[PDB]
Amino acid sequence: NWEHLLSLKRQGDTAKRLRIEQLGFEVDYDRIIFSAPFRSLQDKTQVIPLSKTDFVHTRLTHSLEVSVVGRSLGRMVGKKLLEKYPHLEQVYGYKFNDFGAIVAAAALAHDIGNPPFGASGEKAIGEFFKNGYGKRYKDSLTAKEYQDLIKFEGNANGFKVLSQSKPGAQGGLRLSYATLGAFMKYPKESLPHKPSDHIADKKYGFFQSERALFEDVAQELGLLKRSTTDDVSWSRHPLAYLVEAADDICYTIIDFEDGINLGLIPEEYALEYMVKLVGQTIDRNKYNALQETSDRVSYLRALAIGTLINESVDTFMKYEEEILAGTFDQSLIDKSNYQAQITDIINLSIERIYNSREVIEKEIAGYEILSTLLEARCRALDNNDTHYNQLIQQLLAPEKSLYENLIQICAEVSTMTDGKALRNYKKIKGL
Amino acid sequence: NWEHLLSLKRQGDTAKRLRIEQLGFEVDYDRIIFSAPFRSLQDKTQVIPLSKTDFVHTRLTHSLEVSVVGRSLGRMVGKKLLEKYPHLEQVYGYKFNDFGAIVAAAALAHDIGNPPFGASGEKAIGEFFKNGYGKRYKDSLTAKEYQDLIKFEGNANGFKVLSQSKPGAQGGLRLSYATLGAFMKYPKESLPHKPSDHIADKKYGFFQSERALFEDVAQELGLLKRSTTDDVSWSRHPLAYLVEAADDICYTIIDFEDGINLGLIPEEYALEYMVKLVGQTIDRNKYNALQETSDRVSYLRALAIGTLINESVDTFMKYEEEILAGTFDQSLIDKSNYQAQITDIINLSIERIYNSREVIEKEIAGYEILSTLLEARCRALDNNDTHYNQLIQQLLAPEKSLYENLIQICAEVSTMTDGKALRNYKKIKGL
Ligand SMILES: Nc1nc2c(ncn2[C@H]2C[C@H](O)[C@@H](COP(=O)(O)OP(=O)(O)OP(=O)(O)O)O2)c(=O)[nH]1
Ligand SMILES: Nc1nc2c(ncn2[C@H]2C[C@H](O)[C@@H](COP(=O)(O)OP(=O)(O)OP(=O)(O)O)O2)c(=O)[nH]1
Ligand SMILES: [Mg+2]
Ligand SMILES: [Mg+2]
Ligand SMILES: [Mg+2]
Ligand SMILES: [Mg+2]
Ligand SMILES: [Mg+2]
Ligand SMILES: [Mg+2]
């Protein structure tokens, strides 16, 4: 039921907010814009670590583009939905801008829990507990708590950052429940690991300490259970599909364009792989009148994004009933007519950009930096009577369980930028 | 007349676009988001040069906050305007979201022409032509062209960046005429210098090479002339007042908060100067329950921004007829009840932040960097037969008049970030 999916509740509320008596979905955008975690995204790795103030993307600019594309997708889907179910507007009072606001707010914050150095950073944080110092804690934690530690993802960290309670400020940013539902793409815990081939089962979305919180949200939105066991799991919110589609479109096209502009990909491929996407709307005279690679690739990027957005809207509207029922098992991008072109673009990006020498060098350095910082924090946690551990506490982190302390350490390491992490690493070693 | 101020025309159009047959004001936001000049704002100075990846603001985050505040102001003012003039909605078909879109798009791009190192950078570029090498060109240029060169501001550079014609792409970003009108705050040329004490006469808004372009815009929007001479000048677009109010509110409050968080201002002042702004809505229990300086200053900042936004809307609605007629001479912030508090905050910021030792060091370095780069470009321009000048052209800038070439050099220097400028300066000197 769509009347329960578009909820306006906030954490710690007793009177039900109504749409007629209102806007809730724009304050979420404003609150995310003005927060420190969002501001820390300006110097976090998207693909190339330590961007050197070049023209390449960071996490912040990527999130902004995903937000624009998500607003467009949400507006179109909301128009079609309001056409399909008239009573959503004539009784409850929902307009087609609310869907755009929800998807834009969710897409702006979709990537906020990521640590420095990107995917390699998450792998390093996991390997620290798996085959490093943190291994010593394995006997002192529940299997669900250990699987949280050794398979750390930014998806759970983002939910925690968004919904963190502190003395005097309950609920953290206190976003609406619809935004939280559209933000979550893996509504399950860390065990069991990969129970099936469903798209919503690749990873997990919340930690144990936050688990209870999500239950509340999942009760309010009327999500559909899938547990059939002692481990909880729910079905996806329908707008989470749109969030994922926007994320995928943006990074797939922009990575290719950035690689072309950097000199790692020849310009010819730009027309070898993209023409079928842009052939139906390209103006040949305008394309031929341009005189630099940047203009041509920008033109192609704009046309491709438009085409993919339209196709995604059509695909979503086709399989709406299955998504509402919970039986859909793929993403909207896998039901597309240009899957071969996307696959070729991704494979070329993997061969040329992800495995380039400079990228590998930066990832190797990031492994060492993260391991050193985590080991210092953990050793200061174990013994708190020495002078050195007091100094470490004063520099890095100015009544809890062991699991809560370890989660706090992981969270505090992941709020740093690449530059701050490198500077702290050099300071620890006195260089 | 408001029907002519909200124009949807784009550069190179022959058929008049109508509001009923439509959205135009959102494509402007999307186009600015995806452009390279907007992306270069992530590493440009707001107050503290070479931010060192800290929590302090850059140009990009400042522009985002100004955009949010501008959207709020525009929505409120548009609601009241549509209440005052019913025919704006029942015949033409304008909704209260269009004003918000126009003000948000104008506020997002309000600061895009700024050079590296902020105000000191503009002063250095001017001093280069005034008392440096570029002085040699004084005899070869018209007085209006020389006053453009020696009083370079980012306001004219931003208009040029927004409306730059290139082979195969006429009109640059091709934004709507309403957005261009709301973006311009000084609709006049560089001579005469400060003819009066009007707020719209402190600086100039367009260069000579772009002058003709603005005339077209000023013809379409029905702006009111003020020349009475051979030098053209027009009255302000009414929404430019809202853009300026949002810019002022944001930087005035956030500079204070950032100085407090950095350790340059004691926390006590935070309540000595802000209470009258926040005393009517502050919750004392919530304020006392917080346990860190960051939370308290963030709470105070939010409350102050809300109060100032409401007061600005009231002030604008009071003096609407004078603004439409063109007789208003001050900003909306000078007709406020909290002018003494704002003045005290600004004076404290000047004493403590602008004149701190680190800031002065960075500005002094930026002077040398900009002078070196400009001199190299100009010398390569003068003689183009030497091997060294060919190398300089190949490194820095891979049929025009002298004035056009000098303007192009100034523009190409101002597109660089602080890091890129420093790296190029070191490369020129071989360090
Ligand atoms: N350097 C590097 N970048 C990678 C690698 N794998 C992926 N990336 C980049 C490509 C994209 O810019 C970005 C994708 O991350 P996102 O968090 O946006 O989504 P992703 O689909 O990877 O995962 P998620 O939805 O979070 O489970 O990461 C890799 O092995 N190395
Ligand atoms: N470091 C430093 N920063 C300054 C100085 N004067 C102003 N600022 C900073 C304070 C604000 O963050 C920012 C204001 O620049 P904006 O371009 O936003 O507007 P402003 O009113 O200065 O001028 P405009 O409207 O462009 O004529 O510049 C100065 O002397 N030194
Ligand atoms: Mg992600
Ligand atoms: Mg993904
Ligand atoms: Mg992403
Ligand atoms: Mg400015
Ligand atoms: Mg100003
Ligand atoms: Mg500004």
- Strands of chain A, count: 0
Unique bound compounds = 2'-deoxyguanosine-5'-triphosphate, magnesium ion
Strand content of chain A: under 5%
Specify the oligomeric state: part of a larger assembly
Global morphology of chain A: globular
Descriptive labels:
part of a larger assembly, 2 chains, 431 residues, mainly alpha, 22 helices, binds 2'-deoxyguanosine-5'-triphosphate, binds magnesium ion, hydrolase, dGTPase, nucleotide binding, dGTP triphosphohydrolase
Structural commentary:
- The structure is cut from a larger assembly and holds 2 copies of chain A (431 residues).
- Helix content of chain A is 60%, strand content 0%.
- The first copy, chain A, is mainly α and 431 residues long.
- Chain A is globular.
- Chain A binds chain B through residues 29-30, 33-34, 36, 39-40, 42-43, 52-55, 57-58, 60-61, 64-65, 68, 72, 97, 166-169, 286-291, 294-295, 302, 417-420, and chain B through 29-30, 33-34, 36, 39-40, 42-43, 52-55, 57-58, 60-61, 64-65, 68, 72, 97, 166-169, 286-291, 294-295, 302, 417-420.
- Bound molecules: 2'-deoxyguanosine-5'-triphosphate (DGT) (2 copies) and magnesium ion (MG) (6 copies).
- One 2'-deoxyguanosine-5'-triphosphate (DGT) binds next to helix 12 of chain A.
- Chains A, B: One of its GO terms (biological process) is dGTP catabolic process.
- Chains A, B: This is dGTP triphosphohydrolase.
- Chains A, B: Pfam families: HD.
- Chains A, B: DATP 1 binds at residues 30-31, 72, 301.
